[PDB]
């Protein structure tokens, strides 16, 4: 069954500019049960695929839609899949979101903290608010830039 | 279940009226198959069910459909064994249902009857 999924997913290629520059982007979907990512088929498709985009029922019920788990999702292609306009704001967004993920435990004691820490906390909890989206309303690249 | 479903199929198709199809535990419709499956010579699947669980469930669940000439609203009770929502028999029904209504034991243990789990029971409407 690993051979099953790998024979299929390895067909998604970016051709060699002498075969025609065309490509096929595979976006497979896999359902985990109780978040057991150590299950057999999820581990297979994770080992096979390039990156992963994890979703969370906790984030989903907590309001944030689409409930992307950014801290645990990976992309092995990386910034080479962005335009030059996106990288400049993406670096700062990634750093500030990482600082918010660090200081998330200090939110209940936001009152008794340094002003820089309160700034990082407020910037985090209003950067989380622009990552919310409604269903079937996809932003163009200029709007998200 | 197929008998009652056939009786509802007739009322939807030939009489063209809104049928209301109540089913008790469709976990038993899968459990009976898993009971006979070993004697049918089939090799066992995951945790103990028949290898044809998804197709056997899917045939019955796909015959239940509003067909643009009449509708069938079907309210189904799905016994979840050992309160394990990741069991294969409920897991293969979650794909066939529109509005799932998951009942919690932690609310029944307090008296929040109807113990409908608010954060687990979602709906597509």
């Amino acid at each position: 069954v690993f051979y099953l999924h790998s024979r299929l997913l390895e067909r998604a290629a970016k051709l060699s500019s002498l075969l025609g520059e065309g490509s096929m982007t595979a976006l497979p979907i896999v359902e985990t049960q109780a978040g057991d990512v150590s299950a057999y088929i999820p581990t297979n498709v994770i080992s096979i695929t390039d990156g992963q985009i994890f979703l969370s029922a906790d984030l989903f019920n907590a309001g944030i839609r689409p409930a992307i788990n950014v801290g645990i999702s990976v992309s092995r292609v990386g910034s080479a899949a962005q335009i030059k306009a996106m990288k400049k704001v993406a670096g700062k967004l990634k750093l500030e979101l990482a600082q918010f993920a660090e200081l998330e435990a200090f939110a209940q004691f936001a009152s008794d903290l340094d002003k820089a820490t309160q700034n990082q906390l407020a910037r985090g909890q209003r950067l989380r608010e622009l990552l919310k989206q409604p269903q079937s309303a996809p932003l163009t690249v200029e709007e998200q830039v | 279940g197929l008998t009652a479903l056939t009786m509802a199929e007739y009322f939807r198709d030939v009489n063209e009226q809104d049928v209301l199809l109540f089913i008790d535990n469709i976990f038993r419709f899968v459990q009976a198959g898993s009971e006979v499956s070993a004697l049918l010579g089939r090799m066992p699947s995951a945790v103990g069910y028949q290898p044809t669980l998804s197709t056997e469930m899917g045939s019955l669940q796909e015959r239940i459909t509003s067909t643009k000439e009449g509708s069938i609203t079907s309210i189904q009770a799905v016994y979840v064994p050992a309160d394990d929502l990741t069991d294969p028999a409920p897991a293969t029904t979650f794909a066939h249902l529109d509005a799932t209504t998951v009942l919690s034991r932690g609310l029944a243990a307090k008296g929040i009857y109807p113990a409908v789990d608010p954060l687990d029971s979602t709906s597509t409407m």
Binding site: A34, G35, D36 | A82, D83, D84, L85, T86
Partner: peptide, 11 residues
């Protein structure tokens, strides 16, 4: 459903 119990306890 005991492994999800231990997973949530660890969490």
């Amino acid at each position: 459903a005991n492994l999800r119990e231990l997973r949530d306890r660890i969490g």
